[PDB]
Swiss-Prot record:
Assembly description: Homodimer. Component of the methylosome, a 20S complex containing at least CLNS1A/pICln, PRMT5/SKB1, WDR77/MEP50, PRMT1 and ERH. Interacts with CHTOP.
Residues bearing PTM N-acetylserine: S9
Similarity field: Belongs to the E(R) family.
UniProt protein name: Enhancer of rudimentary homolog
PANTHER family in alphabetical order: ENHANCER OF RUDIMENTARY ERH (PTHR12373), ENHANCER OF RUDIMENTARY HOMOLOG (PTHR12373:SF0)
Main location group: nucleus
Chain's role: May have a role in the cell cycle.
Native species: Mus musculus (Mouse)
Length: 111
């Protein structure tokens, strides 16, 4: 039961390895971190196969981005209630959030 309150934004996650339309797909999330999550996953899943025992996986956060480059171009849409609009960012912006997404994901503070 119980029901408080909490508002979030609508982020969009897409992936573009090549130029062809067949391969690129978009997703939807609530938080920015989550959005990025879909990205990191890309690697994780790709790691799983490589690391079976890997219960939680583990690798260089930079080595993960080594796969983001291979792609054609990674982008993300951030919704700013400010003007209720979506700003098309670059992969770098994602390569940054993701990293930070792993920062908090760990501990950081834990409020």
């Amino acid at each position: 039961g119980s029901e408080g309150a909490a508002t979030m934004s609508h982020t969009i996650l897409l992936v573009q390895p090549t130029k062809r339309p067949e391969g690129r797909t978009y997703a939807d999330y609530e938080s920015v971190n989550e959005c990025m999550e879909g990205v990191c996953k890309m690697y994780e899943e790709h790691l799983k196969r490589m690391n079976p025992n890997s219960p939680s996986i583990t690798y260089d956060i930079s080595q993960l981005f080594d796969f983001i480059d291979d792609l054609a171009d990674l982008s993300c849409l951030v919704y700013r209630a400010d003007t209720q609009t979506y700003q098309p960012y670059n992969k770098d912006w994602i390569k940054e959030k993701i990293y930070v997404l792993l920062r908090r994901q760990a501990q950081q503070a834990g409020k």
